[PDB]
Amino acid sequence: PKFIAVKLIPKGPFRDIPRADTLFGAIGNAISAIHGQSAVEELVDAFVGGARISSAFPYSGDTYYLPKPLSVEPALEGILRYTTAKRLRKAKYLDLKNFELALRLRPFTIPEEIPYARVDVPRVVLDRVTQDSSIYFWEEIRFREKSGVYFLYSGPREVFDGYIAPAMRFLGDTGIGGKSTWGAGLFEVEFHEMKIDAPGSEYSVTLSNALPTKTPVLWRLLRKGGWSFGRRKPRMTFIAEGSIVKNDPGGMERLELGLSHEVYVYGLTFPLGVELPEG
Amino acid sequence: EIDELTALGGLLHDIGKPVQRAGLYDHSTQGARFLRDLAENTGRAEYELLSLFSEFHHKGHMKNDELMIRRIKELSPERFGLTMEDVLNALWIVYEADNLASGPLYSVFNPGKAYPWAELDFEKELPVPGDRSQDYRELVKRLWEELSKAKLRSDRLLPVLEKYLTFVSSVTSEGNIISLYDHMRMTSAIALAMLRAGCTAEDVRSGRCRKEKRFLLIEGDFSGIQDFIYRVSGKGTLKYLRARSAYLELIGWDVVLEILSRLGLTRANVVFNAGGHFMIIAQNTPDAVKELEEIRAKAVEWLYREFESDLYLAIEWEPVSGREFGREGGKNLFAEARKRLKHKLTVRKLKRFGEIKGLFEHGHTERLAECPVCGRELPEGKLEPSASDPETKVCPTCNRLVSLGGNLPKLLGFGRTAKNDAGVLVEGPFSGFVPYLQPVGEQILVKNTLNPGEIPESAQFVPYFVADYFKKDPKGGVATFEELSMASTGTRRLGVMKGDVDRLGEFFSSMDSPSKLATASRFMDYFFKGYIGAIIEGKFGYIIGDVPSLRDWPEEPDIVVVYAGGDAFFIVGAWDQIFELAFRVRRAFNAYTGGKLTLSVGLGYFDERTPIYRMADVVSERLDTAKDEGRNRVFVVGRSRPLSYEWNHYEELWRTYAPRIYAGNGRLKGKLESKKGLLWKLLEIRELYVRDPNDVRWAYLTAYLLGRLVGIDTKAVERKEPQPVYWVDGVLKIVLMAVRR
Amino acid sequence: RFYGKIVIKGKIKAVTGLHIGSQDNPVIKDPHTGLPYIPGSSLKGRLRSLFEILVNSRLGEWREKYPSLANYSPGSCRPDNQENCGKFFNRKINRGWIHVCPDYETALACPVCRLFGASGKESNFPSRIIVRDAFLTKEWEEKWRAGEAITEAKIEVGIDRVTSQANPRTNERVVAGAEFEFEIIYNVENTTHWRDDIKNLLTAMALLEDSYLGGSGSRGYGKVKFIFDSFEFRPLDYYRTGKDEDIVSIDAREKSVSDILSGFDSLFSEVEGKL
RNA sequence: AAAA
Ligand SMILES: [Zn+2]
Ligand SMILES: [Zn+2]
């Protein structure tokens, strides 16, 4: 487990911490604008055969968070306080050092700070003759000073070097989702390496939205849809991140949607090894 | 029938205890004279056979197996069709039921304090724990009248016995905190579970039902309620939310009643149904586990098909034996068999819809859409136009709840019927519900009362309680957020209080029998179901007394209870009558408990026309904020810091800082009028403290501004706790919001 | 298609106090630090409103350059409450009336919605500028760390016309003289439209020099002032290879009136040689 | 999610 880590140093507020389903859609729309139609299909074939990306997770100044495995909920008592056991079950994102602890079913600590805030700003709509207003509210993810968001990449390097690294320079100047004409999804991209110490077992947590091909072990269900060139995507049951499959490669699904081209929904897994309890 | 004679015999065998404390007539023969005397007049010989269960329990007369025989020949088993085998078996079964269910009413919270005797009507005399042989005589007289009048059907006696025997202790001993109602309720529950398991008197005498996995705990729990009831956009009235909180209650009671009516059980088996989380006791036969699995697989599919992965019911069961209802050694066996089921609940909540098996497939129908009130997914139509604004399409089960929110005050109950009938408003997973206006079905749920009036003697009575105080509008219905925000002191806002009992699972994991758990769960239930509306009526001021109040408490306050349940509530209303109500409910929960349990409250003051998902996620976040700090707190108002308060801390502040600046009913003191700017600019001097707590400039500026709080103390700087200028935001800011802003 | 992205950078100078508000009236501020900022929507919609009024004046004189302004009469649709009956401000969002075109192929020829974006039904022409959010220049964070006041508190009053009774309120205004740092990213989607789009965007900016930006503007709370640093073209090949191919025009000391005529024949001669 |  040596992964490339893409860091998205934010220039403004995001609309949401991007799922893998809206990272892959953004990459496909970048590739279709800087390369062409016939190079999105080679991207899709590279992700079918090889590579996988994960969801975006928050970072805050050289500490990188990863989602909590669901493998710790059924045997959180055997790890061990009732206040600690409850706060240790509520929490969503573990630190990289703790996350590698909890993959082996060891006692771990939750971070005492979230790297962003869901704030809703009031906006207004004024008619041009009478300046007569109308409020609506708008939610967004407002980050701290050194904090931001990142995701991980496995697979070969010519796919990263020909597809994902140009896609990230394109999407820095047209954002990842949301009101990107208000300067919302925009960022500066920079790449590092991350290494993850992971136990080699039969079970794997998925760091991206799964959409499985068989029933997993422990899961946390997540309906979402999308919007593809104006057309509404039907709601799909992804598995949320941090969920335990065994040997389940996931699967992308092609949609119809009445367009000039097929629309793939990225339903692949991102496996890290995990140690389970007896169930 | 033996299967109802057993439950009635286990329900009327310790009825000889109030007639013996009264001193009318050996504790059992002097309790069987009651049933024997009642059997002749106003009734039949039905009551005559039920004196066997009082003569022959507690090891007083069931010796040698012959004194039963002359008396049971002296009565007629053939007139009721019972066998000499059957009723002689039912005596032993009721005896072991009482055995392995058992082991002034002292309070379950502080066992050092007792209860005065009362009836249970939620309209007078809040049973605060405190510190006569004729009051029992009046109890027995008024019980004799009711036991004369009522039907002998066991859904007709369980409303009677908890009117009267709730605050009566079962065994008169020191520190006994088990009600007599609940002792007899659980004795009957275990008796019918032994009979439906099929065990008999030779297994009773030979010591076989104990130490054999023969009982079955069923426990079920709703997951995802906060995204079911409060994920609602700006379309959707208050009456719509107040119909969401009574549609989830109807789903829950529907599932419980099919488990009872399909497993052949009575309502004595339900240990509790508080909070969307029920627990019942059942038999362990292999032709019952199959029925439970059918109930689970049908309820879960109706939940998936109706509310797509939004609400979920996690039903599990666990085989126990009779020896695990009590205490063996210093090892708690009921609280270990209950942690073996909580793990199955927890690991079943992580397989969130595994019963469906078509859940992860993609084969979608064409041309979906989305309701604007709740975000659903309805294909190419089936959206029905609303009757509020007929231009906007909504899903049909939002129309079914707008039309139910219209019929909230007019409602005496519900009738639970087969799903495709007339009058059916809303559907449960197994039944349709038709409201019971100003008498249809086989099962009539009747709210907030214990007396069946218009109900057929062929229908099942199920009494349920719901805290449903509301300010009524100029019409006869429910107020909206607009009428609530208008009628408040100060400016126009809306005060939305959540807030629940802290660390209660540790409290319920300490009970070492079901008879004790049933009492503790019923009292914690009845505080929020019943004794929270009696507060908002304006009672119990002898116990409540001094509270932070902006105005004299009105005759008819404007507060709408959205939910009030097992430990929590969610209450809206006039945003500066909600403020007095939070501290008033705290001061009454301190008194209802012995002081042993606490509650947190997150508060929010919203503009009246605000979406309800955000209006709920502000208060639900401020409850976690006021809860992870100290678990005895109150989030009084939003505040800035470098956030909540303790209760007694605020009520010690408000004795001091408030009565020197605030006169009453939204008016400041004399000569501090025309000095309103003195109250805001002090919050400027309060805000040089959050900018730097280390700079000491805020002392002489207060001394200057009061010359035109003032001094520091190392009592704060002994451990770096914040200064007294920091504990004045939530005391000045209320008085500013409720005087002319 | 796509041919590159023109990035316009510079500074805003709040010459008079700047007030936006956050629902005794606060100004909007970053929830973590606490400094103010100018939103991207509050800047973009003010630019769009100014250019809407300018276009509504010129629905007779631009019908040959821009078609589909022939489908509109100058006015508004508030009295006759049918949307897109034929007046210019044709769409009603909630209670107010905006000109937003109803289709793609009618908004490709309307100069407002070609640049600022339309919504329609089944169609949705997205925008073509990104008005990036504007934060204080690091000089004005250093002045914020010197303890200096970055906002003020201005007390105003209303006065009875006969008896001269004071009725005061307070507004929280940004200190006059402040500096924010803006960015506007235009997306070159069609190589014909680029000259007219950047000329219309600079026209919309120059109406904002003589108008205001949020808050009580006619009581003296606007007077924004654009101080450009540089433009960049960022071509299609730049996002492919990541070298330095982007033309950097330099206009470090130029105003938006000195930029529309002085540089448009001259500082864009290099960009028209690459299209 | 501290039995909503
Ligand atoms: Zn709906
Ligand atoms: Zn247009």
Side-chain angles (χ1 to χ4, degrees), chain B residues 500 505 567 631:
Chain B
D500 57 352
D567 57 348
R631 294 165 189 258

Side-chain angles (χ1 to χ4, degrees), chain B residues 622 629 633-646 649-650 653 683 686-687 690 722-723 725-731 733:
Chain B
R622 292 181 181 184
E629 292 172 350
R633 309 299 303 271
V634 55
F635 203 96
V636 175
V637 69
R639 198 177 66 170
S640 60
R641 88 287 192 276
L643 292 85
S644 66
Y645 305 22
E646 192 190 3
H649 190 265
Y650 196 90
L653 280 175
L683 293 176
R686 191 264 178 196
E687 280 293 329
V690 180
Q723 290 290 327
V725 77
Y726 177 71
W727 301 114
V728 80
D729 186 82
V731 178
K733 189 176 280 188

